[PDB]
Design a protein around this ligand. Structure first.
Ligand code: HEM
Length: 451
């Protein structure tokens, strides 16, 4: 069967379609008009975008398809290196890090991070408790402060102290600026790109300089903490028997911050947006938080008892998965969906927001925010809900992100009533991840002691 394809621009094929502020949202609108699969060509490049559960279930077959590094993540690799996210599955350091790091990211390993997550969540609550009557909350901005600080604390026992400042830590500043440059190179040898190829190097330096010092500092001290750095400095891969070397440990810490901060911040921001736009759902979630969070400080077990809050987060991830696409390649020649022959090496993109709007899986009301869709998670078919990727290349931080977001949203709902005082119109800014730009609320304290 012949594959649909969106509009072309002569010798540029489809490439100008992504020369836009909102490429994923453009790709979603194309999927709306062309259907479950469409070909996307560029000068010397071909990929196929998948939007249906019927095809994505095959793409998630790890015997047939492996993770591909997209063009963007090849540029990210210039400072993320061969950390988990930007390494190929067949690279020795991927499987080593995967085996060493998976125990540090278990649902059960969250018990050790809980106290430091509470540390940063308390700072967030206290900041909002301390706002004056006339004042409002910049939601993604504060969620990003929380998630970056939480990864820094739980990751390598480092305090970015984001709630003490307006201009971020020089590391954070230079990371985002480096991520920006990596993104900008998507639409670009020529000597006009000489200053862009000089500033990139400076941002890589500050990130490398500080994390390497931290690792050197910890090796010299020999101190043992509850962070991922300790586990990485003492872990051994059961298969090779080898530990990670210091350079790869550096890339892993850079990777935790790239991979975790924007997605989790976006999730919290989208979750609060849907709550203020659905007051009946907010009330049901607030009643749960009040019922369950009976102590001044949330316990690890209390966070696990926040069932509805977790459903709220999963429904937010259904509508706006904050890492909205992943890339695959065919391991061998194969036929997709019984009608699309693929050659070894052919690339696929999974368009996750469109998968999550497949009316054959979720029903006709896919645009509605309904947390009750997740009452029984086992009813959802295989590969129908994939906000954390697929298989052995799935998000290693899934339990970390969901524990942090359930804790923080639980505390938010316990301690404040929220007002959508501007009747905010959703505006989704796209970097490599999604976030509701300009989202803003008020929050009136329920005056509950906190500690
Ligand atoms: C709501 C929050 C998050 C979302 C939606 C998310 C999404 C994803 C997705 C879709 C992938 C697969 C990417 C691909 O196939 O190319 C991935 C991979 C990854 N994520 Fe997350 N992520 C989140 C939070 C986090 C956090 C908190 C961490 C903490 C370090 C993290 C670390 C990673 C790593 C290391 C990988 C690569 C894993 C591997 O291939 O071995 N993520 N993430």
């Amino acid at each position: 069967k012949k594959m649909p394809q969106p509009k072309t621009f002569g010798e540029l094929k489809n490439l100008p379609l992504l020369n836009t502020d909102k490429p994923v949202q453009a790709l979603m609108k194309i999927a709306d008009e062309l259907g479950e699969i469409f070909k996307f060509e560029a000068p010397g490049r071909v990929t196929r975008y998948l939007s249906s559960q019927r095809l994505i279930k095959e793409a998630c077959d790890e015997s047939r398809f492996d993770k591909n590094l997209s063009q963007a993540y090849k540029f990210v690799r210039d400072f993320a290196g061969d950390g988990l996210g930007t390494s190929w599955t067949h690279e020795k350091n991927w499987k080593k890090a995967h085996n060493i790091l998976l125990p540090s990211f278990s649902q059960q390993a969250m018990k050790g991070y809980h106290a430091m997550m509470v540390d940063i969540a308390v700072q967030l609550v206290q900041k909002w408790e301390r706002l004056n009557a006339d004042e409002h909350i910049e939601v993604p901005e504060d969620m990003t402060r929380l998630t970056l600080d939480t990864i820094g604390l739980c990751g390598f026992n480092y305090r970015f102290n984001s709630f003490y400042r307006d201009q971020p830590h020089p590391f954070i500043t230079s990371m985002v600026r480096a991520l920006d440059e990596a993104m900008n190179k998507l639409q670009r040898d020529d000597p006009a790109y000489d200053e862009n190829k000089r500033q990139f190097q400076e941002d890589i330096k500050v990130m490398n300089d500080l994390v390497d010092k931290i690792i050197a500092d910890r090796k010299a001290s020999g101190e043992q903490s509850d962070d991922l750095l300790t586990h990485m400095l003492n872990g051994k891969d059961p298969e090779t028997g080898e530990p990670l070397d210091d350079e790869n440990i550096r890339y892993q810490i850079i990777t935790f911050l790239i991979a975790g901060h924007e997605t989790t911040s976006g999730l919290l921001s989208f979750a609060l947006y849907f709550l203020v736009k659905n007051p009946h759902v907010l009330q049901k979630a607030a009643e749960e938080a009040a019922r369950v969070l009976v102590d001044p400080v949330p316990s690890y077990k209390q966070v696990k008892q926040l069932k509805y809050v977790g459903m709220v987060l999963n429904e937010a991830l259904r509508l706006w998965p904050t890492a909205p696409a992943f890339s695959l390649y065919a391991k061998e020649d194969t036929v997709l969906g019984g009608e699309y022959p693929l050659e070894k090496g052919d690339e696929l993109m999974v368009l996750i927001p469109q998968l999550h709007r497949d009316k054959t899986i979720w029903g006709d009301d896919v645009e509605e925010f309904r947390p009750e869709r997740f009452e029984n998670p086992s009813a959802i078919p295989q590969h129908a809900f994939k906000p954390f990727g697929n298989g052995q290349r799935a998000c290693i931080g899934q339990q970390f992100a969901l524990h942090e977001a359930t804790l923080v949203l639980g505390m938010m709902l316990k301690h404040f009533d929220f007002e959508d005082h501007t009747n905010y119109e959703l505006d989704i800014k796209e970097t490599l991840k999604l976030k509701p730009e300009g989202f803003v609320v008020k929050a009136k304290s329920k005056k509950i002691p906190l500690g």
